[PDB]
Amino acid sequence: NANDNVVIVGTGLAGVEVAFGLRASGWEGNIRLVGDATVIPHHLPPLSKAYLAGKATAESLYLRTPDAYAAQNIQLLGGTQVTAINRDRQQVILSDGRALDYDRLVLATGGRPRPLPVASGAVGKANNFRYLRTLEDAECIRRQLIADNRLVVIGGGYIGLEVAATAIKANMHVTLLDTAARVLERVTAPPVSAFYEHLHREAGVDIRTGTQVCGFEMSTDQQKVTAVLCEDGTRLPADLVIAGIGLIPNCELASAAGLQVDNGIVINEHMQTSDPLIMAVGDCARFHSQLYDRWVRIESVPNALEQARKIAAILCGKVPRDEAAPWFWSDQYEIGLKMVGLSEGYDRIIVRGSLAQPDFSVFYLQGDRVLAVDTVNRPVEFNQSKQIITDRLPVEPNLLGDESVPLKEIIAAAKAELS
Amino acid sequence: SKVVYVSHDGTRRELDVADGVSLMQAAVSNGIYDIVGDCGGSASCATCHVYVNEAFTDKVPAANEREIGMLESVTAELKPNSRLSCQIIMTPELDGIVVDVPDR
Numbered sequence: 443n444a445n446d447n448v449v450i451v452g453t454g455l456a457g458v459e460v461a462f463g464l465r466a467s468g469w470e471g472n473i474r475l476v477g478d479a480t481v482i483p484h485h486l487p488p489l490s491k492a493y494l495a496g497k498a499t500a501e502s503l504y505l506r507t508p509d510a511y512a513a514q515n516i517q518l519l520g521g522t523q524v525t526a527i528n529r530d531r532q533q534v535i536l537s538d539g540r541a542l543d544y545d546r547l548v549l550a551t552g553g554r555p556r557p558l559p560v561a562s563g564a565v566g567k568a569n570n571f572r573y574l575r576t577l578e579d580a581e582c583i584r585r586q587l588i589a590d591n592r593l594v595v596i597g598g599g600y601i602g603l604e605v606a607a608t609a610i611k612a613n614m615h616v617t618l619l620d621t622a623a624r625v626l627e628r629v630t631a632p633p634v635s636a637f638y639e640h641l642h643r644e645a646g647v648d649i650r651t652g653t654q655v656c657g658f659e660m661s662t663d664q665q666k667v668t669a670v671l672c673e674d675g676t677r678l679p680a681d682l683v684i685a686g687i688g689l690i691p692n693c694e695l696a697s698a699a700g701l702q703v704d705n706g707i708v709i710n711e712h713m714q715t716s717d718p719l720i721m722a723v724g725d726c727a728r729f730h731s732q733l734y735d736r737w738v739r740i741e742s743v744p745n746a747l748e749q750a751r752k753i754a755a756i757l758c759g760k761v762p763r764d765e766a767a768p769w770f771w772s773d774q775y776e777i778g779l780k781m782v783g784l785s786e787g788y789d790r791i792i793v794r795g796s797l798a799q800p801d802f803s804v805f806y807l808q809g810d811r812v813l814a815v816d817t818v819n820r821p822v823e824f825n826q827s828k829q830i831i832t833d834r835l836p837v838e839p840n841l842l843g844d845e846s847v848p849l850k851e852i853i854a855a856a857k858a859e860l861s
Numbered sequence: 862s863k864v865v866y867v868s869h870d871g872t873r874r875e876l877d878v879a880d881g882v883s884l885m886q887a888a889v890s891n892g893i894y895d896i897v898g899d900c901g902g903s904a905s906c907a908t909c910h911v912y913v914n915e916a917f918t919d920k921v922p923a924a925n926e927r928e929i930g931m932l933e934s935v936t937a938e939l940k941p942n943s944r945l946s947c948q949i950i951m952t953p954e955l956d957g958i959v960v961d962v963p964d965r
């Protein structure tokens with residue numbers, strides 16, 4: 443109602459996005475954005491790209507100019523942490539004692555970086571040892587990308603690869619270790635891992651897969667790390683160490699309140715948790731994917747934008763929109779990587795173009811269904827693949843590989859013969 | 862340089878651009894909910910979509926194949942002056958431009 447209080451915990455992309463979207467769909471009640479971060483809400487993708495390269499201003503990171511919040515009558519309560527949720531009393535209690543009343547609650551808590559087990563003690567606290575999840579992390583790391591200095595990145599995910607490529611361009615000596623048998627092991631077919639490994643080895647990255655760090659060596663000062671130690675006995679000397687071994691969803695708040703949790707805050711088709719008045723969105727939310735018929739938790743910008751809009755709709759009585767093809771992207775060196783859909787469980791792949799060039803598309807299929815598409819420097823085939831998945835078009839598999847037949851036509855042909 | 866976004870329902874919102882910044886970045890950062898730029902302004906999603914008026918349809922870095930390829934997917938109607946606001950770097954020689962926010 444126009445006398446209904448909505449409280450949003452977390453001021454990341456997801457949270458500020460339901461706040462402004464909520465106001466754009468007609469919501470008239472009060473809107474409280476409570477986050478523990480103290481900085482102005484900003485984008486994350488640039489923290490391992492242009493901003494890390496130092497080629498973008500801190501201001502260009504702003505999600506919204508700091509004055510747009512007052513203009514939309516969105517109360518932004520920074521530097522504030524929510525410690526608990528009193529469901530029956532229907533309020534959230536802060537650390538500074540205050541209790542906020544709510545009629546509608548949205549958990550947009552995101553996640554915290556998974557700690558590296560042997561980074562305990564003085565290691566984690568070193569200034570030359572860092573995780574890459576915050577603005578501080580990025581600025582702290584950016585100042586240490588000193589030419590000829592050595593860098594050891596631990597973690598094979600996309601952020602890790604984007605850090606290595608940034609460091610290479612900064613003229614650092616870089617080594618990347620992953621416990622998996624290949625980078626992006628779980629999310630990509632062998633040939634796409636091969637492509638990334640060649641690209642980075644060719645650029646000068648020492649990539650040791652199947653490696654597991656067992657400890658670190660510190661300066662006699664105990665203020666900085668000097669080397670990384672692997673289960674295989676090698677000692678990798680390092681001036682800087684960046685770890686990116688994953689994310690842990692911040693579901694504590696929900697678990698403590700009795701809301702069902704399982705590697706994320708569980709939510710239904712309407713984004714609601716076990717409590718009708720409480721919804722969750724973004725990195726922290728585990729939901730049942732309509733398109734893939736499986737419980738999943740996406741950590742991406744499109745997924746957060748999509749879920750926040752779904753929430754805005756539901757709370758404003760609008761009819762929610764169909765699950766869109768999830769997508770994600772990564773920039774490494776000058777290569778544009780764009781991935782739509784989720785490849786897990788594919789029975790085969792179909793390559794459109796040649797894996798020998800930095801220009802091709804990889805289609806992952808399950809039977810005659812397209813689950814996902816990895817594209818390299820192919821923004822247009824990439825964008826067109828979204829409808830294949832979003833609209834579940836029965837595209838002809840035996841044509842995906844024939845580049846003489848435009849993808850628009852192949853899609854158009856399917857979009858006309860759904861039967 | 863100033864930009865004028867003839868937004869939703871007919872209304873309009875005029876703004877300030879640091880010059881060298883795309884109309885998309887400026888719009889979404891100031892609350893022009895009418896236009897979103899999901900992809901980040903790399904010309905990969907087409908949610909930047911805007912109708913540029915003939916008043917300025919010229920001297921606006923003609924959309925290349927990338928954009929044309931993207932534009933095609935615009936959920937709204939595709940017009941001869943449709944462009945990706947994210948591929949429009951505001952410059953002095955473009956003061957007082959008027960972009961049309963397609964219907965969401």
Ligand SMILES: Cc1cc2nc3c(=O)[nH]c(=O)nc-3n(C[C@H](O)[C@H](O)[C@H](O)COP(=O)(O)OP(=O)(O)OC[C@H]3O[C@@H](n4cnc5c(N)ncnc54)[C@H](O)[C@@H]3O)c2cc1C
Pocket residue numbers: 451452453454455456457476477478479485486487488489490522523524525550551552553554574575576601692695723724725726741742743744746769770771772773
């Ligand atoms: C370096 C980096 C690069 C990335 N690159 C890409 C990319 O290229 N493409 C892509 O699609 N995605 C990318 N992503 C991921 C994308 O940016 C995120 O998935 C998205 O921003 C996640 O938004 P979020 O709102 O869910 O949560 P978060 O950003 O985690 O924010 C949740 C916020 O809530 C706060 N919070 C949590 N608990 C509490 C509490 N109890 N009280 C108060 N505040 C609390 C958190 O501390 C945090 O600030 C990247 C992420 C990183 C870190």
Ligand code: FES
Pocket residue numbers: 885897898899900901902903904905906907908909910931945946947948
């Ligand atoms: S923001 Fe994606 S094409 Fe403009």
